[PDB]
Short mmCIF file of C-alpha atoms and ligand atoms in Angstrom, two decimals:
data_model
loop_
_atom_site.label_atom_id
_atom_site.label_comp_id
_atom_site.label_asym_id
_atom_site.label_seq_id
_atom_site.Cartn_x
_atom_site.Cartn_y
_atom_site.Cartn_z
CA UNK Z 1 31.59 64.00 116.15
CA UNK Z 2 35.24 65.08 115.85
CA UNK Z 3 36.75 68.32 114.44
CA UNK Z 4 39.57 68.85 111.90
CA UNK Z 5 40.65 65.20 112.05
CA UNK Z 6 40.63 65.54 115.84
CA UNK Z 7 42.98 68.49 116.04
CA UNK Z 8 40.31 71.07 116.86
CA UNK Z 9 37.78 71.43 119.63
CA UNK Z 10 34.14 72.42 118.87
CA UNK Z 11 35.07 76.08 118.94
CA UNK Z 12 37.53 75.95 115.98
CA UNK Z 13 40.52 76.13 118.35
CA UNK Z 14 43.56 73.87 117.96
CA UNK Z 15 43.74 71.52 120.94
CA UNK Z 16 47.02 72.49 122.54
CA UNK Z 17 49.11 69.64 123.93
CA UNK Z 18 52.23 70.47 125.92
CA UNK Z 19 55.39 68.88 124.52
CA UNK Z 20 53.99 68.33 121.05
CA UNK Z 21 56.44 69.29 118.31
CA UNK Z 22 55.45 70.78 114.96
CA UNK Z 23 57.19 70.46 111.60
CA UNK Z 24 60.14 68.92 113.42
CA UNK Z 25 60.90 72.43 114.61
CA UNK Z 26 58.70 73.92 117.33
CA UNK Z 27 58.19 72.40 120.76
CA UNK Z 28 55.01 73.65 122.36
CA UNK Z 29 55.53 74.48 126.02
CA UNK Z 30 52.25 75.99 127.21
CA UNK Z 31 49.26 78.25 126.67
CA UNK Z 32 49.93 81.92 127.42
CA UNK Z 33 46.98 83.68 125.82
CA UNK Z 34 43.36 82.98 124.84
CA UNK Z 35 41.09 85.16 122.73
CA UNK Z 36 38.25 85.08 120.23
CA UNK Z 37 40.95 84.92 117.53
CA UNK Z 38 42.33 81.69 118.99
CA UNK Z 39 45.36 81.09 121.19
CA UNK Z 40 48.94 82.07 121.93
CA UNK Z 41 51.40 79.42 123.07
CA UNK Z 42 54.97 79.58 124.29
CA UNK Z 43 57.23 77.35 122.23
CA UNK Z 44 60.86 76.52 121.68
CA UNK Z 45 62.23 76.91 118.16
CA UNK Z 46 64.78 74.07 117.72
CA UNK Z 47 66.16 75.67 114.58
CA UNK Z 48 66.88 79.18 115.90
CA UNK Z 49 67.46 77.92 119.44
CA UNK Z 50 65.08 80.42 121.03
CA UNK Z 51 61.73 80.77 122.73
CA UNK Z 52 58.94 82.16 120.57
CA UNK Z 53 55.27 82.96 121.04
CA UNK Z 54 52.96 81.38 118.51
CA UNK Z 55 49.53 82.79 117.79
CA UNK Z 56 47.29 79.98 116.52
CA UNK Z 57 44.30 81.45 114.76
CA UNK Z 58 40.98 79.66 114.90
CA UNK Z 59 40.30 77.39 111.93
CA UNK Z 60 37.48 79.59 110.60
CA UNK Z 61 37.42 81.97 107.59
CA UNK Z 62 36.19 84.96 109.55
CA UNK Z 63 39.16 84.69 111.85
CA UNK Z 64 41.67 83.60 109.21
CA UNK Z 65 40.83 86.72 107.18
CA UNK Z 66 41.07 89.02 110.16
CA UNK Z 67 44.54 87.57 110.89
CA UNK Z 68 45.82 87.95 107.36
CA UNK Z 69 45.20 91.67 107.82
CA UNK Z 70 47.31 91.70 111.00
CA UNK Z 71 50.05 89.89 109.12
CA UNK Z 72 50.04 92.51 106.40
CA UNK Z 73 50.21 95.38 108.90
CA UNK Z 74 52.99 93.77 110.86
CA UNK Z 75 54.95 92.99 107.71
CA UNK Z 76 54.31 96.55 106.54
CA UNK Z 77 55.63 97.91 109.82
CA UNK Z 78 58.69 95.74 110.22
CA UNK Z 79 59.80 96.70 106.75
CA UNK Z 80 60.35 100.24 107.98
CA UNK Z 81 64.02 101.10 108.61
CA UNK Z 82 63.64 103.28 111.78
CA UNK Z 83 64.37 102.00 115.31
CA UNK Z 84 61.01 103.26 116.51
CA UNK Z 85 59.88 99.97 114.95
CA UNK Z 86 61.39 98.10 117.89
CA UNK Z 87 58.34 99.18 119.98
CA UNK Z 88 56.08 96.89 117.97
CA UNK Z 89 56.17 93.17 118.75
CA UNK Z 90 58.20 91.43 116.07
CA UNK Z 91 56.61 88.90 113.68
CA UNK Z 92 59.34 86.40 112.82
CA UNK Z 93 57.23 84.48 110.34
CA UNK Z 94 53.87 82.89 109.74
CA UNK Z 95 52.64 79.63 108.24
CA UNK Z 96 49.61 77.36 107.97
CA UNK Z 97 49.73 74.29 110.20
CA UNK Z 98 46.89 71.74 110.39
CA UNK Z 99 44.59 74.31 108.87
CA UNK Z 100 45.46 77.00 111.40
CA UNK Z 101 47.28 80.19 110.44
CA UNK Z 102 50.14 80.64 112.88
CA UNK Z 103 52.01 83.83 113.64
CA UNK Z 104 55.42 83.36 115.20
CA UNK Z 105 56.44 86.24 117.40
CA UNK Z 106 59.53 86.94 119.47
CA UNK Z 107 58.85 85.78 123.05
CA UNK Z 108 58.04 88.59 125.47
CA UNK Z 109 57.41 88.89 129.20
CA UNK Z 110 54.65 90.20 131.54
CA UNK Z 111 51.96 92.60 130.30
CA UNK Z 112 51.36 95.86 132.23
CA UNK Z 113 48.10 94.64 133.69
CA UNK Z 114 49.91 91.70 135.36
CA UNK Z 115 52.36 94.29 136.55
CA UNK Z 116 49.55 96.31 138.18
CA UNK Z 117 48.26 93.11 139.79
CA UNK Z 118 51.67 92.42 141.30
CA UNK Z 119 51.33 95.76 143.14
CA UNK Z 120 47.85 94.98 144.34
CA UNK Z 121 46.57 97.74 142.11
CA UNK Z 122 48.51 100.40 143.96
CA UNK Z 123 50.51 101.41 140.90
CA UNK Z 124 54.13 101.74 139.86
CA UNK Z 125 56.35 104.74 140.54
CA UNK Z 126 56.14 107.90 138.51
CA UNK Z 127 59.68 107.21 137.29
CA UNK Z 128 58.76 103.91 135.68
CA UNK Z 129 55.49 105.40 134.42
CA UNK Z 130 57.67 108.02 132.76
CA UNK Z 131 59.76 105.34 130.99
CA UNK Z 132 56.64 103.56 129.75
CA UNK Z 133 55.08 106.85 128.60
CA UNK Z 134 58.16 107.76 126.62
CA UNK Z 135 58.19 104.49 124.76
CA UNK Z 136 54.46 104.55 124.13
CA UNK Z 137 54.70 108.01 122.60
CA UNK Z 138 57.52 106.90 120.34
CA UNK Z 139 55.47 103.89 119.24
CA UNK Z 140 52.51 106.13 118.51
CA UNK Z 141 54.83 108.50 116.64
CA UNK Z 142 55.90 105.51 114.60
CA UNK Z 143 52.33 104.40 113.83
CA UNK Z 144 51.66 107.95 112.72
CA UNK Z 145 54.30 107.89 109.91
CA UNK Z 146 52.22 108.58 106.72
CA UNK Z 147 52.87 105.33 104.84
CA UNK Z 148 51.59 103.52 107.91
CA UNK Z 149 48.91 105.74 109.54
CA UNK Z 150 47.99 102.84 111.80
CA UNK Z 151 45.36 103.17 114.49
CA UNK Z 152 46.10 100.46 117.03
CA UNK Z 153 42.55 100.84 118.25
CA UNK Z 154 42.87 98.62 121.35
CA UNK Z 155 45.52 99.97 123.61
CA UNK Z 156 45.28 98.89 127.22
CA UNK Z 157 47.50 97.49 129.99
CA UNK Z 158 47.04 93.90 128.74
CA UNK Z 159 48.38 94.79 125.25
CA UNK Z 160 51.59 96.39 126.42
CA UNK Z 161 54.25 93.85 127.39
CA UNK Z 162 57.64 94.01 129.04
CA UNK Z 163 60.41 92.78 126.72
CA UNK Z 164 62.27 91.24 129.72
CA UNK Z 165 60.95 90.95 133.31
CA UNK Z 166 64.12 92.76 134.46
CA UNK Z 167 64.28 95.76 132.13
CA UNK Z 168 61.70 98.47 131.48
CA UNK Z 169 61.53 98.18 127.68
CA UNK Z 170 58.09 97.48 126.24
CA UNK Z 171 56.48 96.39 123.00
CA UNK Z 172 52.85 96.69 121.91
CA UNK Z 173 51.13 93.52 120.80
CA UNK Z 174 47.87 92.51 119.19
CA UNK Z 175 47.19 94.37 115.98
CA UNK Z 176 44.23 92.15 115.25
CA UNK Z 177 41.72 94.88 115.99
CA UNK Z 178 43.71 97.53 114.11
CA UNK Z 179 43.20 99.62 111.02
CA UNK Z 180 44.61 102.47 108.93
CA UNK Z 181 42.92 105.90 108.61
CA UNK Z 182 39.92 105.58 106.32
CA UNK Z 183 36.17 105.10 106.05
CA UNK Z 184 34.27 104.21 109.25
CA UNK Z 185 33.21 100.66 108.48
CA UNK Z 186 32.60 100.13 112.25
CA UNK Z 187 31.81 102.20 115.36
CA UNK Z 188 31.92 100.13 118.56
CA UNK Z 189 35.74 100.19 119.01
CA UNK Z 190 38.47 100.17 121.73
CA UNK Z 191 38.16 98.62 125.24
CA UNK Z 192 35.50 100.45 127.21
CA UNK Z 193 37.73 101.94 129.92
CA UNK Z 194 40.02 103.31 127.24
CA UNK Z 195 37.36 104.36 124.69
CA UNK Z 196 37.81 107.95 123.50
CA UNK Z 197 34.96 110.52 123.65
CA UNK Z 198 34.67 110.69 119.83
CA UNK Z 199 34.02 106.96 119.63
CA UNK Z 200 31.42 107.07 122.40
CA UNK Z 201 29.75 109.98 120.60
CA UNK Z 202 29.76 108.27 117.18
CA UNK Z 203 32.01 110.76 115.49
CA UNK Z 204 34.79 110.35 112.92
CA UNK Z 205 37.93 108.94 114.48
CA UNK Z 206 41.59 108.97 113.57
CA UNK Z 207 44.98 108.14 115.24
CA UNK Z 208 44.09 110.54 118.04
CA UNK Z 209 41.98 107.85 119.75
CA UNK Z 210 45.21 105.96 120.59
CA UNK Z 211 46.51 109.01 122.43
CA UNK Z 212 43.36 109.17 124.57
CA UNK Z 213 43.87 105.52 125.43
CA UNK Z 214 47.50 106.23 126.33
CA UNK Z 215 46.50 109.02 128.72
CA UNK Z 216 44.02 106.77 130.48
CA UNK Z 217 46.72 104.15 130.68
CA UNK Z 218 49.48 106.28 132.14
CA UNK Z 219 47.21 107.42 134.99
CA UNK Z 220 46.27 103.80 135.66
CA UNK Z 221 49.91 102.73 135.70
CA UNK Z 222 50.59 105.21 138.50
CA UNK Z 223 47.46 105.04 140.66
CA UNK Z 224 46.90 101.34 140.10
CA UNK Z 225 43.29 101.84 139.04
CA UNK Z 226 41.42 102.53 135.77
CA UNK Z 227 40.86 106.26 135.48
CA UNK Z 228 37.40 105.81 133.96
CA UNK Z 229 35.79 102.45 134.76
CA UNK Z 230 32.41 102.43 133.13
CA UNK Z 231 30.09 99.47 133.53
CA UNK Z 232 28.43 100.48 130.22
CA UNK Z 233 28.82 103.35 127.72
CA UNK Z 234 26.54 105.74 129.58
CA UNK Z 235 28.32 105.08 132.85
CA UNK Z 236 31.63 105.49 131.01
CA UNK Z 237 30.82 108.95 129.58
CA UNK Z 238 29.58 110.11 132.96
CA UNK Z 239 32.82 109.16 134.62
CA UNK Z 240 34.77 111.03 131.93
CA UNK Z 241 32.51 114.02 132.57
CA UNK Z 242 33.13 113.97 136.35
CA UNK Z 243 36.77 114.65 135.57
CA UNK Z 244 36.83 116.71 132.40
CA UNK Z 245 33.46 118.45 132.50
CA UNK Z 246 30.80 118.73 129.82
CA UNK Z 247 32.35 118.41 126.35
CA UNK Z 248 32.47 121.64 124.27
CA UNK Z 249 29.14 122.46 122.65
CA UNK Z 250 30.70 122.69 119.22
CA UNK Z 251 31.62 119.00 119.48
CA UNK Z 252 28.31 117.90 121.02
CA UNK Z 253 26.38 119.82 118.35
CA UNK Z 254 27.78 117.44 115.70
CA UNK Z 255 27.71 114.29 117.82
CA UNK Z 256 25.29 111.72 116.31
CA UNK Z 257 24.98 109.96 119.68
CA UNK Z 258 25.11 113.10 121.82
CA UNK Z 259 21.53 112.64 123.07
CA UNK Z 260 22.49 109.25 124.47
CA UNK Z 261 24.33 111.03 127.30
CA UNK Z 262 23.31 114.68 127.05
CA UNK Z 263 20.22 116.83 126.53
CA UNK Z 264 20.07 120.22 124.82
CA UNK Z 265 18.25 122.81 126.93
CA UNK Z 266 15.95 125.42 125.36
CA UNK Z 267 18.84 127.92 125.49
CA UNK Z 268 21.12 125.77 123.33
CA UNK Z 269 23.60 124.63 125.98
CA UNK Z 270 24.17 120.99 126.89
CA UNK Z 271 23.58 119.22 130.21
CA UNK Z 272 23.99 115.67 131.43
CA UNK Z 273 20.78 113.76 131.07
CA UNK Z 274 20.93 111.69 134.26
CA UNK Z 275 24.19 111.05 144.25
CA UNK Z 276 25.57 108.83 141.49
CA UNK Z 277 28.15 111.30 140.12
CA UNK Z 278 30.12 114.26 141.33
CA UNK Z 279 29.21 117.51 139.54
CA UNK Z 280 30.88 118.03 136.12
CA UNK Z 281 34.60 118.74 136.36
CA UNK Z 282 34.79 118.42 140.14
CA UNK Z 283 36.77 115.17 140.26
CA UNK Z 284 40.03 116.96 139.51
CA UNK Z 285 42.94 115.07 138.03
CA UNK Z 286 45.08 117.21 140.36
CA UNK Z 287 43.58 115.19 143.24
CA UNK Z 288 43.38 111.80 141.56
CA UNK Z 289 47.13 111.97 141.15
CA UNK Z 290 47.63 113.44 144.61
CA UNK Z 291 49.92 116.17 143.21
CA UNK Z 292 50.28 118.02 146.53
CA UNK Z 293 49.56 115.12 148.83
CA UNK Z 294 52.40 112.70 148.05
CA UNK Z 295 50.81 110.87 145.14
CA UNK Z 296 48.06 108.26 145.07
CA UNK Z 297 47.03 107.45 148.65
CA UNK Z 298 50.03 109.50 149.71
CA UNK Z 299 52.16 106.37 149.35
CA UNK Z 300 54.78 108.36 147.42
CA UNK Z 301 55.47 111.08 149.96
CA UNK Z 302 59.24 111.59 149.95
CA UNK Z 303 60.20 109.42 146.95
CA UNK Z 304 62.82 110.77 144.60
CA UNK Z 305 61.17 112.07 141.43
CA UNK Z 306 57.75 112.54 143.06
CA UNK Z 307 57.99 116.25 143.85
CA UNK Z 308 55.04 118.59 143.33
CA UNK Z 309 56.97 119.92 140.36
CA UNK Z 310 57.34 116.43 138.87
CA UNK Z 311 53.65 115.73 139.40
CA UNK Z 312 52.67 119.06 137.80
CA UNK Z 313 54.56 118.17 134.65
CA UNK Z 314 52.81 114.77 134.60
CA UNK Z 315 49.38 116.30 135.15
CA UNK Z 316 49.84 118.76 132.30
CA UNK Z 317 50.88 116.08 129.84
CA UNK Z 318 47.95 113.86 130.80
CA UNK Z 319 45.53 116.76 130.42
CA UNK Z 320 46.94 117.47 126.93
CA UNK Z 321 46.17 113.80 126.03
CA UNK Z 322 42.68 113.88 127.50
CA UNK Z 323 41.70 116.86 125.38
CA UNK Z 324 38.06 116.39 124.34
CA UNK Z 325 38.86 117.81 120.94
CA UNK Z 326 40.74 115.30 118.75
CA UNK Z 327 41.95 118.15 116.57
CA UNK Z 328 43.88 119.76 119.44
CA UNK Z 329 44.71 116.68 121.54
CA UNK Z 330 48.49 116.56 121.76
CA UNK Z 331 50.25 114.54 119.10
CA UNK Z 332 53.14 112.05 119.57
CA UNK Z 333 55.88 114.33 118.29
CA UNK Z 334 54.98 117.09 120.70
CA UNK Z 335 54.23 114.85 123.65
CA UNK Z 336 57.80 113.62 123.29
CA UNK Z 337 59.00 117.19 123.67
CA UNK Z 338 57.05 117.78 126.84
CA UNK Z 339 58.97 118.69 130.06
CA UNK Z 340 57.66 115.61 131.79
CA UNK Z 341 60.35 114.02 129.63
CA UNK Z 342 63.02 116.70 129.85
CA UNK Z 343 66.00 115.84 132.05
C1 LIG M 1 48.76 87.47 125.02
C2 LIG M 1 50.21 87.47 124.70
N1 LIG M 1 50.67 87.80 123.27
C3 LIG M 1 50.01 88.18 122.14
C4 LIG M 1 48.66 88.37 122.00
C5 LIG M 1 48.01 88.73 120.83
C6 LIG M 1 46.50 88.89 120.88
O1 LIG M 1 48.62 88.92 119.74
S1 LIG M 1 51.00 88.36 120.93
C7 LIG M 1 52.22 88.01 121.72
C8 LIG M 1 53.53 87.96 121.31
C9 LIG M 1 54.54 87.61 122.20
C10 LIG M 1 54.23 87.31 123.52
O2 LIG M 1 55.22 86.96 124.42
C11 LIG M 1 52.93 87.36 123.92
C12 LIG M 1 51.92 87.72 123.03
#
């Protein structure tokens, strides 16, 4: 047996061959991304004389349809005048090639997870974390513009890439798992480590879940490690609880999956259901960040911009993003006005 006249493997993926040239225009260099959607290759565009990243979607309706949605969102975004739009990876064009939908993007650099790996998971300085945070908030502010109302829904280190390995500018990629505010067609969403409490609880979600993800991400960028690394959903909620405490009863009283993690005592209050975890709220963010001890592992003692004052501004902003209540979790516009960003 052979697939798609020999162009595809048995998993609907296009068999990538280095040096092959398509439509007398693109010269495929190499594979730079794999996914359930298909692949992402680096390629040289002979016509525009530039490197581009091409996302080759699997030759399968399920995937083709999911990608057409990403194309519409991207086209919808790029057609918006503001310069906040230069925080979203740019879709140059798309076309069908050998039965595969292809999205041509501008070529980017390393993703923030690779960045953390190049530090041996020790983290980057607070000053660079600040630059990333500022851009991320602007991007979220952008996605929040009414006509868009886009919920990225899968923010994580891997989906944030450096524009150039030298500069600190970033762009968010992968809008294949995205969606606009609406009905809840699906519930299991976001990468586990960055999954917001509302999602874990089975409650209605909106753009606020991206902000939760961002808060988890900023802490990871600076300490080098995932703030909440659950092996499964129960383990995940417990780790969130160690740091933030038991969620407010008003939220847990409406949480369809509340009893998956908590139990309501005869007096109406909620407790963890169950030395695996520190007591609720005892794993203080103040200490994870090392606010008064020279940062994570004290490896920042003495660095410019790593004063107790600087760290206090960073802790406050993170705590406003990790607000259990999505109604009062800080929004993009205000996060941007936070003193962590003031000069
Ligand atoms: C994995 C890398 N990656 C993308 C992944 C997805 C899922 O869309 S998209 C994209 C665009 C430019 C680039 O340089 C890398 C890149």
